[PDB]
Amino acid sequence: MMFNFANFYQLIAQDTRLQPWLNVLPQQLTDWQNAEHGDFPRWLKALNKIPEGAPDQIDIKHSVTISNDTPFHQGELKKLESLLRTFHPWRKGPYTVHGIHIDTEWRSDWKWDRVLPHISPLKNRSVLDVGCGNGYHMWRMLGEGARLCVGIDPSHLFLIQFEAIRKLMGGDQRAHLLPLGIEQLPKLEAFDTVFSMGVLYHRRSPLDHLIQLKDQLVSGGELILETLVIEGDETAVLVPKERYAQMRNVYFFPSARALKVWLELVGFEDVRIVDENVTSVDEQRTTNWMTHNSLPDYLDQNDPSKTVEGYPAPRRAILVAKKPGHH
Amino acid sequence: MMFNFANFYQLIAQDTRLQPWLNVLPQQLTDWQNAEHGDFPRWLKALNKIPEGAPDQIDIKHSVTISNDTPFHQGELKKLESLLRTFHPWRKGPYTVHGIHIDTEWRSDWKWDRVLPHISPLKNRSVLDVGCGNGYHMWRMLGEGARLCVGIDPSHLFLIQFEAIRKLMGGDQRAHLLPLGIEQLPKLEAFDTVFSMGVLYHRRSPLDHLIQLKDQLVSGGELILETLVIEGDETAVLVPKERYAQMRNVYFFPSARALKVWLELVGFEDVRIVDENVTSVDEQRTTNWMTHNSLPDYLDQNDPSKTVEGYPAPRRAILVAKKPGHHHH
Amino acid sequence: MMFNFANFYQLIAQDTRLQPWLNVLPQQLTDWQNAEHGDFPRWLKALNKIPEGAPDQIDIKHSVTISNDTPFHQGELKKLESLLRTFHPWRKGPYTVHGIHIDTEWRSDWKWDRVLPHISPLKNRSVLDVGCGNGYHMWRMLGEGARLCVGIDPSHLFLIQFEAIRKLMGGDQRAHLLPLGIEQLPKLEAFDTVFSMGVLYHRRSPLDHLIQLKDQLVSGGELILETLVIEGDETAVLVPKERYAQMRNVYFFPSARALKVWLELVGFEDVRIVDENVTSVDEQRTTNWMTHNSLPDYLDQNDPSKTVEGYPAPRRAILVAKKPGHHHH
Amino acid sequence: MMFNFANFYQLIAQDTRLQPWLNVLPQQLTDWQNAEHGDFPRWLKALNKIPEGAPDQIDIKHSVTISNDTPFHQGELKKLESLLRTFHPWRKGPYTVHGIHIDTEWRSDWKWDRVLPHISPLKNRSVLDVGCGNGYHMWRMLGEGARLCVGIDPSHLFLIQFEAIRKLMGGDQRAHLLPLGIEQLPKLEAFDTVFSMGVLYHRRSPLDHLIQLKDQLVSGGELILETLVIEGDETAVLVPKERYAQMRNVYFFPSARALKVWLELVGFEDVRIVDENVTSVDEQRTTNWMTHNSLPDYLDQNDPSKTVEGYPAPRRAILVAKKPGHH
Ligand SMILES: Nc1ncnc2c1ncn2[C@@H]1O[C@H](C[S@+](CC[C@H]([NH3+])C(=O)[O-])CC(=O)[O-])[C@@H](O)[C@H]1O
Ligand SMILES: Nc1ncnc2c1ncn2[C@@H]1O[C@H](C[S@+](CC[C@H]([NH3+])C(=O)[O-])CC(=O)[O-])[C@@H](O)[C@H]1O
Numbered sequence A, D: 001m002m003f004n005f006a007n008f009y010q011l012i013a014q015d016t017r018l019q020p021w022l023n024v025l026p027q028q029l030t031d032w033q034n035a036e037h038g039d040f041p042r043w044l045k046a047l048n049k050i051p052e053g054a055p056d057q058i059d060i061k062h063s064v065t066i067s068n069d070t071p072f073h074q075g076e077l078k079k080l081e082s083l084l085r086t087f088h089p090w091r092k093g094p095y096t097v098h099g100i101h102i103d104t105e106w107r108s109d110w111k112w113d114r115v116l117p118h119i120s121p122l123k124n125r126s127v128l129d130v131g132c133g134n135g136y137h138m139w140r141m142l143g144e145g146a147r148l149c150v151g152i153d154p155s156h157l158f159l160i161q162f163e164a165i166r167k168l169m170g171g172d173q174r175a176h177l178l179p180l181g182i183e184q185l186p187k188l189e190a191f192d193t194v195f196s197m198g199v200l201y202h203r204r205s206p207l208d209h210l211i212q213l214k215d216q217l218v219s220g221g222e223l224i225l226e227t228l229v230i231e232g233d234e235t236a237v238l239v240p241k242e243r244y245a246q247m248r249n250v251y252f253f254p255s256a257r258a259l260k261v262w263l264e265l266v267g268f269e270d271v272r273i274v275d276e277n278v279t280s281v282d283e284q285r286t287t288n289w290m291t292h293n294s295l296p297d298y299l300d301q302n303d304p305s306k307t308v309e310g311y312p313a314p315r316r317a318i319l320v321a322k323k324p325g326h327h
Numbered sequence B, C: 001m002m003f004n005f006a007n008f009y010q011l012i013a014q015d016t017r018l019q020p021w022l023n024v025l026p027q028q029l030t031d032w033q034n035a036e037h038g039d040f041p042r043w044l045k046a047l048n049k050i051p052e053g054a055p056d057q058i059d060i061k062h063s064v065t066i067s068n069d070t071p072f073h074q075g076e077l078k079k080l081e082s083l084l085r086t087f088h089p090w091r092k093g094p095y096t097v098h099g100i101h102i103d104t105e106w107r108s109d110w111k112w113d114r115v116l117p118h119i120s121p122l123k124n125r126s127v128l129d130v131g132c133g134n135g136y137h138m139w140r141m142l143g144e145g146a147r148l149c150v151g152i153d154p155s156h157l158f159l160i161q162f163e164a165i166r167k168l169m170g171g172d173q174r175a176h177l178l179p180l181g182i183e184q185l186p187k188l189e190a191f192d193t194v195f196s197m198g199v200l201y202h203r204r205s206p207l208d209h210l211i212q213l214k215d216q217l218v219s220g221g222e223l224i225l226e227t228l229v230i231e232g233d234e235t236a237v238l239v240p241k242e243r244y245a246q247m248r249n250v251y252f253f254p255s256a257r258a259l260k261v262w263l264e265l266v267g268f269e270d271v272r273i274v275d276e277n278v279t280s281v282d283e284q285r286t287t288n289w290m291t292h293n294s295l296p297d298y299l300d301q302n303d304p305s306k307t308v309e310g311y312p313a314p315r316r317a318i319l320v321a322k323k324p325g326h327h328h329h
């Protein structure tokens, strides 16, 4: 055992639509325990030292912020910041936790602000965040009164990052992060909304990825799809020979208009392109909490409209679609 | 879904020793749902109509009896008896439930009275009842303050019977009946005591059966083993060509002394023969709640010391043993 | 058993590089037998009535033609033509077999004439023809003195078509057609050359298709890849919402220049675009041996530069590449 | 690869009844290759140095003897005896190979002489020898003109012993030894006669063993069963607490009369007890070619009617039965 999913098993046991997941999940999480990880003992020691118990004040609507009415002992807060810094690098956020500003590489709040206007309201929806990161968005989803948020992300570190914020929220049992790939989920068809943001370009079969997403949605369930794109008509599809913005293991970068046809082919209805944004270096930068290289380093030093490799520079697109049938 | 094991999954999720069972159990129970059963929709309709919520008085120590301080409406009690009668045939008991006497084929209380004197105390033990029936014994095990009782029995009907009594106990979550064969359990090694009573003669590989039991016990954990036997030394082993007391799918009937060597060979310690009883027709008979044939039908009409087939008549033996190692508790 | 692969099992048993295929193939072929097919009993009856034993003259170099020095009885030849016609529709060819011209829908000879100029010599190579059809090309591959030809094609009919020509070649054991999808092959890395012609647009994951091909090649082994394309730079990739030329289960149509980058990304070396051809209605037409609809039906009746659906009309591209490493031969 | 079963795969490919075995056999033999063995490289080096090519004269009818009309060079024969001695210990035989007498621990010829009188003639039968040893009996089975003999035995050494004699028979392709347990065979129902001699007492589920045998027989196929027994009626079944004649991992020793009921229960017809023999120290002894301990050592030093452990001394029984249906 690295980490005990006892409470998740309990949740999905008592869910009519998720119980069938127990037929495959526990053997996968058992095998994940046994693929031991160098840094997980250390990370755990730190997560255990993080103050237990509820905060007084929580805002997950306009931000992800945690405070107490009584200011917390300046000894315990210097220790907390120290603990949280053990989980470097901090890519998705930002978080303000008892007045510690976790300035994450990404302004993941901005991406949320772009998405929210175009989704069906999350009030009482079950959501899947595919490639959820440390689960920043799952917190914002609960902010809009989602019933339940399930994140999946292979990163051991992003699990510890999430369990840290969760512990500091007093162990909120309405969000969970499972250390799985999307390819490991069976055809659950259990979720009202599914988010897949920043995953498609990492997946060697994009069509199979769109189908795997469709397979987690109930009838008339809603898909938010966010991915890096290029400009063009339905025939515009960049597949890089080598790297794109210093990433390796990346595959398809279709135009928003091609991706819209792809989603239709696979069987989605009401497919809408609702935003195209060109990632600025104010949205993605190196920080105090993520000290590695970031977008400035990945652009052409003399042309920010291009990647170092010469390809069109990062452009993110949001598409929203319905799976066929009624809700 | 015939029956939702939601609460069992919840229990074993939060147990250190049982959580690994989630790696194999749920796909088996899923497949059990999908092997449809003729009578289970009907049985369920009846189980749902049984009054839910706690009784005032429960005795699971000297019997299995349920009563309220407030008398029940004679309308509601005639309806209850009617509901409970739909779960015919009632083989293991007996139960007294709001003054309705379920006269079961078996005096399963008597077998309990024979066993209890020879076991380590159940106070705070986790127990596995292999071939538990409707779980009569699991109730008596909680009566002796067992922490947790898990029953294994393939019978769809014995599940309905159990969930009926459980509902009438106010949904006691300390006993559970899973519709599995012992052969379907992995090597859990999670149980303080394991009962296997009336199973060994049904199992084509007796030694594999003893090992499957040993594999559910923690270190120094205790096995109660009850089975039909014959008289003789350690080389006395009846394997019937025919049937034995009308039973069709039946294999080994060793002497208590042979079974004791078998248990030793397989690796058990402190193996003790603690009782041999010749099943009387007062212990196993036809009744108003089990109207089918029973032991008097299965004996020679001329000689009750023999089965109709001519073999020595039913003789049940209790053996108790320890799995190697020290028991921490 | 629909068809017994006894001889294939025998071949691959005695091959160093193919024997590991016995770990997975036979259970797949067993399951294929048990997925019964309406027409296969009939087709078999006809294949069995085709004269067995060697012809005197075989040309598999400039054509696929079979003749005898002794004229055949006009009784036996009318019967043969009748037998061969039961295997309608005949899509890949053409074949001339004891003077019977099988006018196949496709001039598959022409596609061969386009390919041969750009390949490393097949003399003594083991080849895999992925989506081989009735195996027309595997015959031409042996014509260039390939050591061994293995075809993969799910079509029950294309198997019957192949075994017919093979029987009429006197049971040539150097070509074989297995009724598999490419997705069913393990990572054999056993083949000098691999052909994939007319398959990529049928496959929902094109990159996984290119990798599955790379996985059948030995080091420095050669891939011929032929597929429908569009014009454009490396970002030109048609994925049709509708159908494309009446085809229903169809996915990626990249430009030859995009497909070349795709092959590079996946890890191929020396990737060359060696030909782009616009399928004429002289290369693909209805015939007396393929009486169904064909390309003229699938084009805009007003504009042969477009499909009925309005997309650019069929354009086939040949690419040739090397799998990394030195090729020992 | 330790050993290439290429020729066996070829045989069973072209057999109508054995081809289905290819659905499971090759993965098992692949896994057997990968469970490497300390001594198999060495044993192989020796097997490779054994003279190739046919002998002139072969008797597999009254013995297992190999000779040439021209006596073989006394240099090459001293080398052969040396090679064959590398395969110590030699338990089943005896063999006479170019005048080298392999005096095996067991007079396995005697056991054959006891069996032969009671079996249906092997002329053109396919046979399975379960726990075949080095395959001595499979040679005698071909002596009676069996069509094909398949032996199964987990012992790496007994495989090398067999391939040695086979090579010295000029690579006879009508007998084969697969390094499998009986439990590894599927329900082939492909064999005219099945021998199981000296296996039952080693098998923790005797009934499952009898069923596994029944499952390799065609309809009205014949089972020879040989095993150690005790005296008594159908209720006489010795299961030892510890060891029996120094063996561990031994289980049931029923009386011949109990075993006969067991065979009936499992579904065999025409079950016949055709011989009970008390193993003498002339049938099983230490030798020149098997220098380890043997039966004299396993008996009570002062009572040869008992094992060292005190149990009745070794007694072997032959039973013959038909699987239901016609041939
Ligand atoms: N097989 C896989 N299955 C699931 N996730 C995976 C897999 N492989 C990698 N990931 C995860 O995909 C995420 C990619 S970042 C998106 C985060 C957030 N949603 C965001 O939109 O800010 C993209 C970006 O912003 O560049 C990481 O968290 C990986 O672990
Ligand atoms: N594979 C199997 N696995 C588990 N149980 C099985 C299996 N096969 C049958 N059973 C069950 O074994 C029980 C046997 S009665 C013992 C009841 C109680 N304990 C009593 O001792 O009164 C025997 C007797 O009459 O004594 C039944 O409930 C079967 O469903």
Ligand SMILES: Nc1ncnc2c1ncn2[C@@H]1O[C@H](C[S@+](CC[C@H]([NH3+])C(=O)[O-])CC(=O)[O-])[C@@H](O)[C@H]1O
Pocket: C092, C106, C108, C111, C130, C131, C132, C133, C134, C137, C152, C153, C154, C155, C158, C180, C181, C182, C183, C197, C198, C199, C202
């Ligand atoms: N999963 C699959 N795996 C393998 N083959 C498949 C699969 N699915 C379909 N096929 C087969 O792919 C072939 C396609 S035709 C190429 C014939 C010849 N090579 C030609 O180039 O003329 C295309 C064309 O018309 O050009 C058919 O024989 C299908 O059975």
Ligand SMILES: Nc1ncnc2c1ncn2[C@@H]1O[C@H](C[S@+](CC[C@H]([NH3+])C(=O)[O-])CC(=O)[O-])[C@@H](O)[C@H]1O
Pocket: D092, D106, D108, D111, D130, D131, D132, D133, D134, D137, D152, D153, D154, D155, D158, D180, D181, D182, D183, D197, D198, D199, D202, D226
């Ligand atoms: N699972 C198994 N499956 C098959 N064979 C096995 C297994 N385990 C062990 N064996 C084999 O069973 C044989 C036992 S000697 C019989 C030889 C010959 N038939 C004889 O009758 O002289 C018995 C004796 O004579 O004591 C050995 O060759 C083991 O490898």
